Design a protein around this nucleic acid. Structure first.
Ligand SMILES: [Zn+2]
Length: 252
DNA sequence: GGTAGATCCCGAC
DNA sequence: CGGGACTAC
């Protein structure tokens, strides 16, 4: 799930778990648990705590309990469901939080790339994976000025810059490619090569693109198909180690 | 310190 | 082969 999907999850999941008390935590793939390193300590500390809130930072979910926060990332294919402890689990279920009311919060992930970290609430923001996370793309904290400052100080491509979690929180591949197209900027452009005008335009499109989604693709996954604006075949290459889609006419 | 690289998984190729 | 977010040049 990308940022907008994670926000939907945050909004929809909260009422399904708020006020419920954890009675057990069951772990079927320990590698998902990143802190405490010992999955048994992770499970033990959560028992007896009640879910009080659910927040989002980038693509991370932050479950707020009594004492602790659970920081969860779903990566490409992770998903949460709330269901009865009486029913068989769905395939690829790796972590289950059992509540005293007989319901469960279940984490599924066919790829097993997801991560979970638990810390005392007051420590979560200064520990991995939240430490160093950049500003929310939809917050005034993410400004053209902030973007420009990062762009000038690097030799990397503009795409690499936007994918950097320290630059902006949870701005995914699909939105990077779409935003760059809408801004008329080639993904392989050196970040430092962007004019003040281009930085302003890029910020504008980043906010518009992801903002619209949080509330029709031009290039992403459209290689070999005509550009919706000019008819030129969309091309796909590798930039910043990722599949990258662009129109060679609209973007410069 | 900045930057790339190794790293995890497994279904679709 | 792809992909989000600790180690070594
Ligand atoms: Zn075009």
């Amino acid at each position: 799930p990308q940022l907008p999907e994670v926000e939907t999850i945050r909004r929809t999941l909260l009422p399904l778990i708020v006020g419920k008390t954890i009675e057990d935590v069951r772990i079927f793939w320990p590698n998902i648990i990143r802190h405490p390193r010992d999955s048994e300590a992770f499970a033990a500390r959560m028992i007896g705590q009640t879910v009080r809130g659910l927040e989002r930072r980038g693509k991370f979910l932050k479950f707020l309990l009594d004492r602790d926060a659970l920081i969860s990332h779903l990566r490409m294919e992770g998903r949460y469901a709330v269901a009865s402890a009486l029913e068989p689990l769905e395939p690829h279920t790796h972590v289950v939080f059992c509540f005293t009311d007989g319901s469960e919060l279940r984490y599924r992930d066919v790829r097993k790339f997801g991560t979970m970290h638990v810390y005392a609430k007051e420590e979560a923001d200064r520990r991995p994976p939240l430490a160093e996370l950049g500003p929310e793309p939809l917050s005034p904290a993410f400004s053209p000025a902030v973007l420009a400052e990062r762009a000038v100080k690097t030799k990397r491509s503009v795409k690499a810059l936007l994918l950097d979690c320290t630059v902006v929180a949870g701005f995914g591949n699909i939105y990077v490619d779409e935003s760059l197209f809408r801004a008329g900027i080639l993904p392989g452009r050196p970040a430092a090569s962007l004019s003040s005008k281009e930085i302003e335009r890029l910020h504008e499109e980043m906010v518009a693109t992801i903002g619209e989604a949080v509330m029709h693709l031009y290039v992403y996954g459209r290689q070999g198909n005509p550009c919706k604006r000019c008819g030129t075949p969309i091309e796909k290459t590798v930039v910043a180690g990722r599949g990258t889609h662009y129109c060679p006419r609209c973007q410069r």
